[PDB]
Design a binder for this molecule. Structure first.
Ligand SMILES: CCCCCCCCCCCCCCCCCC(=O)OC[C@H](COP(=O)(O)OCCN)OC(=O)CCCCCCCCCCCCCCCCC
Ligand SMILES: CCCCCCCCCCCCCCCCCC(=O)OC[C@H](COP(=O)(O)OCCN)OC(=O)CCCCCCCCCCCCCCCCC
Ligand SMILES: CC(C)OC(=O)[C@H](C)N[P@](=O)(OC[C@H]1O[C@@H](n2ccc(=O)[nH]c2=O)[C@](C)(F)[C@@H]1O)Oc1ccccc1
Ligand SMILES: CCCCc1oc2ccccc2c1C(=O)c1cc(I)c(OCCN(CC)CC)c(I)c1
Ligand SMILES: CC(C)CCC[C@@H](C)[C@H]1CC[C@H]2[C@@H]3CC=C4C[C@@H](O)CC[C@]4(C)[C@H]3CC[C@]12C
Ligand SMILES: CC(C)CCC[C@@H](C)[C@H]1CC[C@H]2[C@@H]3CC=C4C[C@@H](O)CC[C@]4(C)[C@H]3CC[C@]12C
Ligand SMILES: CC(C)CCC[C@@H](C)[C@H]1CC[C@H]2[C@@H]3CC=C4C[C@@H](O)CC[C@]4(C)[C@H]3CC[C@]12C
Ligand SMILES: CC(C)CCC[C@@H](C)[C@H]1CC[C@H]2[C@@H]3CC=C4C[C@@H](O)CC[C@]4(C)[C@H]3CC[C@]12C
Ligand SMILES: [Ca+2]
Length: 1282
């Protein structure tokens, strides 16, 4: 009993009264310890107050309590538990820190263990323990993804180390010497005159001796810096900063490949991998939950509540019948509610209330607020009257039994209280009158799929327990890391720079806000840089602290994806399935009612023969492609060029051929909605000729309308139209969530308008607190130097995104929900003081919850609901294939593999010396030696550092030559072992051969530059990825899935093309300028640059800033040619940049899930039972027993064949000459000769003996079944007939 020996009971009588009362006092002690840790405020440079001293005093009490508890629990038994060892080490480290603090007086750094005490609160309650274990157990399948991410990070770090090796160290120094790097405020790297980078064409010169872009933290100077930069880029946070810095230090044409490929491979592909693996795991758990019958409990309770709703009023209807005026009164009112007019009346009143609420804005007219107040009072009175009419008619038990009627009742009861409270001047309105807009969802009742939304809410209310437990786990994780961050960076974020940091760890609320901002992944690298500079800096011991921001980013973004996706998936796997269970009851029941009550020289010779043929079908597809290419190659920045002349003239013939084709189209038919489209587009193209001098506004909507050229090829490309149709179907399916999310967004926007109506204004200098004061000039000091003053004008400006009215609030909340620039908006809204005034530092921190709750509800919950709904909808679309035969989706594939299998060829040659080298090469020790040598070579490669010694470089070159020569030696022997005619018949052998000859030419060039071939040396490391079976199979299956669905990605390609063109035609002129989001690096001036900008926006880097930088009121380039001051730049940027972000993202969700879809077979596999992986090794073990594919085996070979098969496929460690061989020989094998039994026959016999066995005499049943529902067999199983 985990005790064995028992010491005398005289002092071990402790397990008697330690069950009920000793299990809770310790939990309260832990809670008090957490509160005390939260109260502690870290001061910079040993400062303190009274509260810190009191807390340090009570820490002694907590330590003695925990030590007494540990001693009592240890005298009970001599710690082996996982969660008790943690308590023991916590208490021992606490004692050590306490004695060190008492004796020596880093001591303080040692007490960072205190943050582990809240974690012990998990162990107290098993309800959180089980959910924590469920969260943890999902980490095992993602270890392969983690290893892949590590390998790609290492490879890209080495490649970037080779490419960008200390190049980011030259900048422009305006002063005659190196004093204060006089290059604006944030200097950028530059290149010398002989270089291809950026040269400052000013009075300044490019001179080396520069620390680096981000204080020397972001650069590929050595392996650690390069790896950190690659990770920070792969997290898709500030990768464009690194890209632009490299584009300034080196040329702009080469290094985009590195970052674009890194983003595509290490971010999008990895996210797809994670989503697929997690979806498979959740589907497996959902299928496992059927045995427990969780869905049965929800189903019975669903059909029971509707019984009570229709029965309580039924007996209430009996009360209304006279066997008093009261019953007559109740009868009239009861039928008044169920009149189909009262419902529309209350809907109209709700819409009127929404109209009244949504009409509030900054400095609204007085009559508007008077009508707002009187209409609000009238509508509140009418809604109270509606409440009274409904409650009296149905009754209290018949009213509160409805879930919705519990919502509007609370809404009215709280709204009247808030109304009176605001009326009596207690506080500004909170906004609780806005949630009356939820009742506007009652319109869905008339439409179909109202019950589908009700099923989701019912499932959520059923699973509220698990939802609360998961949210508690997330909150505890956030609290623990906030305490750790407060301990590590408490008061260390105070540098000399004029702008004090807002995202610090000074207080507990500030630490919570910073940790939440890091978890959302927005500007987390800035916090990491501040934390690095908080310590010594870019040195060896001052950089390790960066790992704190890595685990928090890795262990946090993971937890969310197992908290808000699972909740989204399971509660959507119930409701949909729930809606699948009732939707037959509403069909059979009526069927019960129905079953009772009812009882011209235009022919295919010279004008149409070569029209409908595929040749003409795909000949015009090439011409549509060429027309699109010509459209994409225009020059927007200049209106009159010879380049625009040829393409502006090449379309004249292009439209001439297309117009000719339309003549061939009017004769064939007298017309669906496709052959008009092109015609209509063609009908627009002729206007291009009829312009003359009227190019004022007609062409401004004529040239932009040319982007419809690519999208008319969907009709002529079968498969693309199918994908578009599937996309439209998915849109119509997801509308049910889209409308609800939009309504919730509108509600939050109204609340935000009520909160920050005009409060976000600020003046240029913080001294002036009103617009009247904010006038004239003021004096600002450059870089916080009292001796460097500059006059600057005083400006009274609003926020970039404000809450002045409902539309501005919706824009701001959208930019917040995209996680772009939300910390700045949060910290600007924190300072909002009064309706028309300026900001006060940290006036209301508590308003931050508004920006947090929203992010929890819209950003994290609604989006995950969206993704899970897409996943479940696609799964049910792929699952409804009504093929319910005997073989249940597994034996079908097993029999297919058994039929489509063949032994592998031997290729074991004679000429024993060649056979001797073949035996040497194939040995596993040789493969281990190669893996060791590859690791050594990549270690040598990952050792070069900036500022290295010349002898170091010579030694590295010598080692490179030695390793390369050894690899050529290995390649030659291999070649002689496998012969040139068979050595190259392997995907990996050709890969190795190209690298070796690619690593030789540059070796020759070393003694004679170009660095393209050097990178080949790194690529050999990818061979190490082909060693683990699971990761290799996962990668290969995902790659095949991507190969099988090209048109889904073609949709994203087409969307990128169209938008780009649109951006080139509209925003393609705006002048390039620094200190602006439109510069040499980010612009619409060329098609590749527009594509790069759109990729940047799809990644979501600073798109909310490019939108503002594309606003009207900009000058544009002198290349394009009175009134041209700044009349150049449109207001389309609101619809252009928002819609794109909502479209592209959706398309990506379409590409991910689909790729996941057709790959469920691997994702939900249950490797324990038989599967294609198990049957794969049969060929590998019979390859050496069959000279070729053939199909002829040895009768005696079965002796070792039966032994070599694994227990999952064959038999365990039992004796071979036993019932296994008896059953193998006793069954009905084909009636061939002694050893002329063919491979697939034996394979089918083995797979039949493994599972799915039947009585003798049913072989012909399998024979007819393998041709009825199983795919074609081509009469190839003649030798397998018996
Ligand atoms: C999810 C999946 C989504 C897929 C999205 C794919 C995104 C691809 C992004 C491509 C962006 C290309 C930007 C680029 O290359 O930069 C522009 C550059 C112009 O360089 P420029 O500034 O003129 O040179 C001055 C020298 N100091 O351009 C160049 O010089 C490069 C030439 C154009 C790029 C050609 C690539 C296509 C291959 C054609 C063959
Ligand atoms: C998560 C939930 C997702 C839904 C969120 C919806 C967000 C809507 C954005 C808020 C509308 C803002 C309207 C506005 O202020 O005017 C936009 C513009 C007029 O320009 P204006 O903003 O006055 O100029 C700058 C002012 N200082 O006028 C316009 O350009 C009008 C159109 C702007 C709004 C377009 C909404 C995009 C929807 C795309 C649908 C995608 C599929 C098609
Ligand atoms: C890659 C994105 C920006 O390009 C898109 O356009 C997609 C269309 N938008 P999306 O919102 O991507 C953001 C989510 O990435 C999660 N993330 C990432 C790495 C990780 O290790 N763990 C993890 O949870 C996350 C941090 F939670 C975010 O919520 O799409 C999704 C929406 C819901 C669920 C999954 C993806
Ligand atoms: C089908 C054509 C329009 C697509 C679309 O319409 C919506 C209306 C309301 C809410 C969402 C959408 C929507 C999206 O497809 C969509 C939008 C966003 I924002 C979104 O989240 C991505 C931004 N952010 C996550 C919070 C990433 C950091 C996702 I996933 C899907
Ligand atoms: C059912 C709901 C969504 C309907 C709400 C629509 C009406 C009431 C809203 C939508 C957009 C709003 C406008 C948005 C912007 C401005 C500009 C501002 O200088 C005066 C107010 C004004 C003109 C708002 C008045 C109210 C408005 C017209
Ligand atoms: C996230 C939690 C669970 C674990 C992460 C470990 C972090 C917090 C720990 C592990 C190793 C630690 C570092 C180890 C060594 C040094 C050098 C010293 O001169 C200052 C502290 C510093 C820089 C530590 C900072 C905190 C640190 C980075
Ligand atoms: C599959 C689709 C997206 C491929 C589209 C390829 C076409 C549109 C691209 C590929 C290469 C591109 C060219 C590459 C380089 C330049 C030089 C630059 O000074 C003007 C644009 C110009 C001339 C580009 C025009 C557009 C272009 C021709
Ligand atoms: C990724 C695997 C396979 C190879 C890389 C692991 C080892 C060899 C790497 C990891 C960290 C690396 C070190 C990181 C930092 C420096 C400081 C620099 O001034 C000289 C090189 C030196 C000392 C690197 C040498 C190589 C190194 C020790
Ligand atoms: Ca960002």
């Amino acid at each position: 009993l985990c005790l064995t020996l028992k010491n005398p009971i005289r002092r071990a009588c402790i397990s008697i009264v330690e069950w009920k009362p000793f299990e809770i006092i310790i939990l309260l002690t832990i809670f008090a310890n957490c509160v005390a840790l939260a109260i502690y405020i870290p001061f910079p440079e040993d400062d303190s107050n009274a509260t810190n001293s009191n807390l340090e005093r009570v820490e002694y009490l907590f330590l003695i309590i925990f030590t007494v508890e540990a001693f009592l629990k240890v005298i009970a038994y001599g710690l082996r538990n996982g969660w008790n060892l943690l308590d023991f080490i916590i208490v021992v480290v606490g004692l050590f820190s306490a004695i060190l603090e008492q004796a020596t007086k880093d001591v303080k750094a040692l007490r960072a263990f205190r943050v582990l005490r809240p974690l012990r609160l998990v162990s107290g309650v098993p309800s959180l323990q089980v959910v924590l274990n469920s969260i943890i157990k999902a980490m095992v399948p993602l270890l392969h993804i983690a290893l892949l991410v590590l390998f790609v990070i290492i490879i890209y770090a080495i490649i970037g180390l080779e490419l960008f090796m200390g190049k980011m160290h030259k900048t422009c120094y305006n002063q005659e010497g190196i004093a204060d790097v006089p290059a604006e405020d944030d200097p950028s790297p530059c290149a010398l005159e002989t270089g291809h980078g950026r040269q400052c064409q000013n009075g300044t010169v490019c001179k080396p001796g520069w620390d680096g872009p981000k204080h020397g933290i972001t650069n590929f100077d050595n392996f650690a810096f390069a790896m950190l930069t690659v990770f920070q880029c792969i997290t898709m946070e500030g990768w464009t900063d690194v890209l632009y810095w490299v584009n300034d230090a080196v040329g702009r044409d080469w290094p985009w490949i590195y970052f674009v490929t890194l983003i595509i491979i290490g971010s999008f592909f990895v996210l797809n991998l994670v989503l697929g693996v997690l979806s498979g795991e959740f589907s497996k758990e959902r299928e496992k939950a059927k045995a427990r019958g969780d869905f049965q409990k929800l189903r019975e309770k669903q059909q029971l509540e509707e019984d009570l709703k229709g029965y309580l009023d039924w007996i209430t209807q009996a009360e209304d019948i006279d066997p008093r005026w009261n019953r007559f009164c109740r009868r009239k009112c009861r039928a008044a509610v169920k009149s189909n007019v009262f419902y529309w009346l209350v809907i109209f009143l709700v819409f009127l209330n929404t109209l009244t609420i949504a009409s509030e804005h900054y400095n609204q007219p007085n009559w508007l607020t008077e009508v707002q107040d009187t209409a609000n009072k009238a509508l509140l009175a009418l809604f109270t009257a509606e409440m009274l009419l409904k409650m009296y008619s149905l009754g209290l038990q018949a009213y509160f039994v409805s879930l919705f009627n519990r919502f509007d009742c609370f809404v009215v009861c709280g709204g009247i209280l808030e109304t009176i409270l605001v009326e009596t001047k207690i506080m500004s309105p909170l906004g609780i009158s806005v949630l009356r807009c939820v009742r506007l969802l009652r319109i869905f009742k008339i439409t179909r799929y109202w019950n589908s939304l009700s099923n989701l809410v019912a499932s959520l209310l059923n699973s509220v327990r698990s939802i609360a437990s998961l949210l508690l786990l997330l909150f505890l994780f956030i609290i623990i890391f906030s305490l750790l961050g407060m301990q590590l960076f408490g008061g260390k974020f105070n540098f000399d720079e004029m702008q004090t940091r807002r995202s610090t760890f000074d207080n507990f609320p500030q630490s919570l806000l910073t940790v939440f901002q890091i978890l959302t992944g927005e500007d987390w690298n800035s916090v990491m840089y501040d934390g690095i500079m908080a310590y010594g800096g870019p040195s060896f011991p001052g950089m390790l602290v960066c790992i704190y921001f890595i685990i928090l980013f890795i262990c946090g973004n993971y937890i969310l994806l197992n908290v808000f996706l699972a909740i989204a998936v399971d509660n959507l796997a119930d409701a949909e399935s729930l809606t699948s269970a009732q939707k037959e009851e509403e069909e059979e029941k009526e069927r019960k009612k129905l079953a009772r009550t009812a009882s011209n020289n235009r022919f295919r010779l010279q004008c149409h023969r070569i029209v409908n043929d595929t040749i003409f079908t795909n000949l015009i597809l090439f011409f549509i492609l060429l027309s699109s290419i010509s459209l994409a190659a225009e020059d927007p920045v200049q209106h009159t060029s010879f380049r625009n002349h040829i393409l502006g003239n090449a379309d004249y013939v292009f439209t001439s051929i297309f117009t000719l084709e339309i003549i061939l189209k009017m004769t064939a038919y007298g017309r669906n909605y496709f052959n008009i489209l092109d015609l209509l587009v063609v009908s627009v193209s002729l206007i291009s000729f009829g312009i003359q001098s009227s190019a004022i506004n007609v062409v401004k909507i004529l040239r932009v309308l040319r982007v419809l050229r690519p999208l008319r090829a969907i009709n002529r490309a079968k498969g693309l139209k199918h994908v578009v149709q599937c996309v439209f179907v998915a849109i119509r399916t997801i509308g049910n969530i889209v409308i609800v999310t939009t309504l919730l967004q509108f509600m939050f926007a109204c609340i935000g308008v009520q909160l920050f109506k005009g409060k976000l204004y600020t003046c240029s200098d913080s001294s002036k607190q009103t617009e009247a004061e904010c006038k004239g000039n003021y004096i600002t000091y450059k870089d916080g130097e009292v001796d460097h003053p500059i006059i600057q004008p005083r400006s009274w400006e609003n926020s970039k995104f404000d809450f002045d009215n409902v539309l501005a609030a919706m824009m701001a909340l959208f930019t917040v929900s995209t996680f772009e620039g939300w910390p700045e908006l949060l910290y600007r809204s924190i300072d909002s003081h009064t309706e028309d005034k300026g900001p006060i530092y940290n006036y209301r921190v508590e308003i931050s919850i508004f920006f947090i709750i929203y992010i929890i509800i819209i950003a994290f919950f609604m989006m995950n609901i969206f993704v899970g709904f897409v996943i479940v909808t696609f799964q049910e679309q792929g699952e409804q294939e009504y093929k319910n035969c005997e073989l249940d989706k597994n034996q079908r594939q097993c029999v297919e593999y058994a039929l489509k299998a063949r032994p592998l060829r031997r290729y074991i040659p004679k000429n024993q010396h060649q056979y001797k080298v073949w035996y040497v090469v194939n040995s596993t020790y040789f493969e281990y030696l190669m893996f060791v040598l590859i690791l050594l070579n990549t270690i040598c490669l990952a050792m070069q550092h900036y500022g290295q010694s010349c002898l170091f470089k010579i030694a590295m070159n010598i080692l490179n030559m030695l390793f390369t020569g050894l690899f050529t030696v290995e390649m030659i022997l291999k070649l002689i072992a496998f012969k040139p005619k068979g050595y190259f018949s392997d995907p990996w052998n050709v890969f190795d051969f190209l690298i070796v000859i690619g690593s030789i030419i540059d070796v020759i060039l070393s003694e004679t530059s170009i660095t393209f071939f050097r990178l080949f040396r790194v690529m050999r490391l990818v061979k190490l990825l082909s060693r683990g079976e699971g990761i290799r199979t996962l990668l290969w299956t995902f790659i095949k899935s991507f190969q099988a669905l090209p048109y889904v990605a073609l949709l994203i390609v087409m969307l990128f093309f169209i938008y780009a063109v649109i951006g080139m035609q509209v925003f393609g002129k705006i002048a390039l300028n620094d200190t602006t989001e439109i510069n040499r690096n980010n612009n619409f001036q060329t098609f590749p640059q527009a594509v790069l900008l759109l990729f940047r926006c799809a990644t979501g880097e600073a798109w909310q800033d490019i939108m503002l930088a594309c606003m009207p009121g900009k000058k544009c380039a002198p290349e394009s040619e009175t009134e041209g001051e700044t009349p150049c730049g449109s207001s389309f940027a609101v619809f252009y940049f928002i819609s794109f972000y909502m479209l592209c993202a959706f398309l990506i969700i379409n590409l991910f899930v689909a790729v996941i879809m057709d790959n469920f077979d691997y994702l939900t596999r249950d490797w324990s039972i038989l599967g294609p992986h198990h049957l794969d090794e049969f060929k590998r073990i019979w390859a050496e027993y069959d000279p070729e594919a053939k199909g002829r085996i040895k009768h005696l070979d079965v002796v070792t064949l039966l032994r070599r098969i694994q227990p999952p496929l064959g038999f365990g460690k039992l004796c071979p000459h036993r019932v296994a061989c008896k059953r193998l020989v006793s069954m009905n094998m084909p009636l061939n000769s002694d050893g002329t039994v063919m491979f697939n026959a034996t394979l089918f016999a083995l797979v039949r003996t493994a599972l799915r066995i039947k009585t003798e005499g049913n072989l012909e049943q399998a024979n007819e079944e393998l041709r009825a529902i199983i795919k074609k067999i081509w009469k190839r199983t003649s030798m397998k007939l018996l």
